Design a protein around this ligand. Sequence first.
Ligand SMILES: *[C@@H]1O[C@H](CO)[C@@H](O[C@@H]2O[C@H](CO)[C@@H](O[C@@H]3O[C@H](CO)[C@@H](O)[C@H](O)[C@H]3NC(C)=O)[C@H](O)[C@H]2NC(C)=O)[C@H](O)[C@H]1NC(C)=O
Length: 231
Amino acid sequence: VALRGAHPYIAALYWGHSFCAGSLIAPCWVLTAAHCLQDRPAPEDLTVVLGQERRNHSCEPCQTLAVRSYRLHEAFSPVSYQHDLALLRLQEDADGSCALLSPYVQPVSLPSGAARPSETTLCQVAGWGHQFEGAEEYASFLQEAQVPFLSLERCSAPDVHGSSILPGMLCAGFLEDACQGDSGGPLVCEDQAAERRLTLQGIISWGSRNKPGVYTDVAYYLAWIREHTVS
Ligand SMILES: *[C@@H]1O[C@H](CO)[C@@H](O[C@@H]2O[C@H](CO)[C@@H](O[C@@H]3O[C@H](CO)[C@@H](O)[C@H](O)[C@H]3NC(C)=O)[C@H](O)[C@H]2NC(C)=O)[C@H](O)[C@H]1NC(C)=O
């Protein structure tokens, strides 16, 4: 029995005329890419929607929340895209409550740390993708894709991605498709060094169609994550 949605952890981030995807990791915390927020957008500007099916559409199970604070990695290189992750702190509603777990909204598990994915480890990426301005009624539904994992040996190679792959990045893709997937968005993969079979291995970074995708390697920042969520 399936009493939980597809990708019920996926968060949508709206401010101004800007948009990023994200990953609910606890009911009060969302994890994204750094570069979505370089410009230092004032927390009170941002809107985050959980449990959303189509981009910028409302829906019964959608929960809209305000963001009370965020932060980017100290070492985030706006040039190289290296420490590309930020945390956002949702705003506890009246009565001290962020993101009411439902079939449509549940956090996603962080990686074991001892998640050592081979290249036949199965992985999935989800998002909305490009949508044309205007005409909210012709939105697009959440989409998904199986991507194979890509060892850094094969990814860091120059016919491929070269010295552009720094520490704390990983790749998944086909060498040879990719318009779904939004900045900030989740890559989730089989783990089995956690009780929960599925874990959050990636955040969508850069990479884009004929060349692999590059992701912040979430285990790598696993301490940064706790150091900053335990608050
Ligand atoms: C579709 O995209 C829009 C961006 O183009 C989103 O816009 C945001 O809507 C919010 C309300 O849903 C705003 O917040 C509210 O602001 C006023 C204060 O002036 C108050 O009335 C509300 O209480 C407050 N919300 C609170 C406290 O929770 C945002 O400021 C607004 N931002 C912009 C730039 O327009 C849509 O929400 C988004 N929707 C969906 C469903 O995807």
